[PDB]
């Protein structure tokens, strides 16, 4: 009936020694009590694709704002794949706020979460500054977070470049791992990309 295509974040990456193309991709279709969401999110360099997670979710609003979702995780590694029951809530309010919380299970007693928001702070018309976060656990539990800084002036509302930072962490077992292969636990990054949706 409708839909909405917002690829929120279309981004080169660049850190330590280390460079990539990533994207972040929410999208959904249906109406106005009822939906399937399409979220993609994923990581390449040197043209091989380093990860990529797709979710299809089934989006049933709860209020004005907000949706319960329930649905798949499949996720993609060169070598490997895994694929997650996922169950949460959403909400979405273009030019104001993005927020969810969501749970994932998965076969071997597998079990993650993933809490995420951001929300925007116009400074005119069309430049806008996004704050945002993620934070993700894993339990076979807190591996990462990110706080991000986005800075995009909206050429056309569709075609908005922008510039950024994020401030990435590790912790517990990930932040060892990370250590024990000579990588510092944490890593400011920097971000030039586009945010497009229509
Ligand atoms: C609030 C905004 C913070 C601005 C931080 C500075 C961003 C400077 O970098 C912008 C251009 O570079 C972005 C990432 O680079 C792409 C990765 O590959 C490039 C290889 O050089
Ligand atoms: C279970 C997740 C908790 C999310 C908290 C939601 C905030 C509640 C108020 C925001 C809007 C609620 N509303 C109006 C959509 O019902």
Not at 81 to 89: D, E, I, Q
Not at 153 to 167: D, H, L, M, Q, T
């Amino acid at each position: 009936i409708n839909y909405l295509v917002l690829l929120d974040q279309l981004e080169w990456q660049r850190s330590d020694n280390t460079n990539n193309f990533s994207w972040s991709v929410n999208s959904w279709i249906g109406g106005d009590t009822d939906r399937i969401w399409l979220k993609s999110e994923g990581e390449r360099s040197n043209g091989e694709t380093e990860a990529a997670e797709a979710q299809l979710l089934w989006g049933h609003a709860v209020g004005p704002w907000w949706d319960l979702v329930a649905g798949v995780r499949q996720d993609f590694r060169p070598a490997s794949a895994r694929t997650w029951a996922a169950v949460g809530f959403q909400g979405l309010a273009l030019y104001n706020f993005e927020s969810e919380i969501t749970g994932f299970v998965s076969n071997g007693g597998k079990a993650a979460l993933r809490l995420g928001g951001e929300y925007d702070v116009l400074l005119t018309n069309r430049l806008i500054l996004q704050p945002s976060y993620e934070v993700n656990f894993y339990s076979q539990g807190l591996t990462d977070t990110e706080l991000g800084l986005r800075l995009r002036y909206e050429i056309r509302r569709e075609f908005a470049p922008y510039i950024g930072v994020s401030w990435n962490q590790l912790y517990g077992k990930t932040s060892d791992m990370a250590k024990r292969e000579g990588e510092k636990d944490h890593q400011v990054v920097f971000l030039a990309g586009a945010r497009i949706w229509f």
